[PDB]
Amino acid sequence: PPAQLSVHTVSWNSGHERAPTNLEELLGLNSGETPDVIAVAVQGFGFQTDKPQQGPACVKNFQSLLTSKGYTKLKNTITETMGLTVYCLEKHLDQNTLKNETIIVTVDDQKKSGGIVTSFTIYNKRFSFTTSRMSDEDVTSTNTKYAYDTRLDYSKKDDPSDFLFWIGDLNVRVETNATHAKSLVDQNNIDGLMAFDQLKKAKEQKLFDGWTEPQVTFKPTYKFKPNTDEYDLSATPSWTDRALYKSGTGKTIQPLSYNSLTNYKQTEHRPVLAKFRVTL
Ligand code: HEM
Numbered sequence: 001p002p003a004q005l006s007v008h009t010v011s012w013n014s015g016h017e018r019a020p021t022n023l024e025e026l027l028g029l030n031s032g033e034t035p036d037v038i039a040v041a042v043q044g045f046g047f048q049t050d051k052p053q054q055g056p057a058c059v060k061n062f063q064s065l066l067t068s069k070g071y072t073k074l075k076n077t078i079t080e081t082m083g084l085t086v087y088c089l090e091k092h093l094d095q096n097t098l099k100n101e102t103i104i105v106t107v108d109d110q111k112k113s114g115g116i117v118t119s120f121t122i123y124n125k126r127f128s129f130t131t132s133r134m135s136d137e138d139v140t141s142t143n144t145k146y147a148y149d150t151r152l153d154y155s156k157k158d159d160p161s162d163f164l165f166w167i168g169d170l171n172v173r174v175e176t177n178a179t180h181a182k183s184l185v186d187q188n189n190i191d192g193l194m195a196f197d198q199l200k201k202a203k204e205q206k207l208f209d210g211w212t213e214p215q216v217t218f219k220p221t222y223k224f225k226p227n228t229d230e231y232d233l234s235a236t237p238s239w240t241d242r243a244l245y246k247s248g249t250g251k252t253i254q255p256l257s258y259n260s261l262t263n264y265k266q267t268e269h270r271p272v273l274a275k276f277r278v279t280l
Helices: 055-069 178-186 190-194 199-204
Strands: 004-015 037-044 071-078 082-089 101-106 114-122 125-133 163-169 241-246 253-260 272-279
Touching: 004 163, 004 241, 037 125, 037 163, 055 071, 071 101, 071 114, 082 114, 082 125, 163 272, 178 190, 241 253, 241 272
Parallel strands: 004 037, 125 163
Antiparallel strands: 004 272, 037 082, 071 082, 101 114, 114 125, 163 241, 253 272
């Protein structure tokens, strides 16, 4: 058993946009790194119906590239508004130890909000990967707008997972006016603007209890005018896509890198990539 494994996560609230052609950058492969596990979460509209017939392109392009490197897809799950894919290096898998499971939780009767958790075991350690989506208008279990639900949190089980990641647009925003937020951005006072971020408020209500975010040192990833680096100040600039981590069993998870990918400008949000090292 290796003593450590590397995990990359990426999430993008990509809306109606199709998978780009350069995937290596998106997945953090472009520096020569070969991580053990890769999870990709997207949020948007119409993935299941698939009017545009993008599904077959996604499969082809992700499968070509990743199969080439020795990955196997453990699971792809899509609903109308969320997608979560998890890949693992083939060499790590043992069929009768894996216990691959996915639940979907749906909160509203239109099945647009909730989340997905995919869990699996390697080297006798359980990994769980969650993504979630909530809209501002929703009635929820928490009576907040945040994309949290206890059923999605595998640290609140009697047998909690060893390594947990929660990736996506949590529907946490910066709670101040757009002029002030832009001023802080222009001065590169990232910690000053993070003071207004709603994750700490959610945590005060004991949502995302004991989940940690890596230090943010990049500018808000939303809301941009498509194909520019210009903020549309009709919304307060915010950090939308986030990566949170936890261990249920006292394992060390060390973030190596956490950054937005500013080369991807096709849309209003920028994708966010995190890299972690975990000690088994
Ligand atoms: C940048 C945006 C997107 C990203 C990053 C992305 C990512 C992914 C990934 C990683 C997979 C699994 C591929 C595999 O099999 O290895 C997938 C599958 C799929 N995607 Fe995309 N996707 C995007 C956009 C979309 C859009 C806009 C639609 C439809 C409106 C869509 C529809 C689908 C469908 C239907 C599948 C499953 C196909 C099947 O199982 O036959 N995706 N996507």
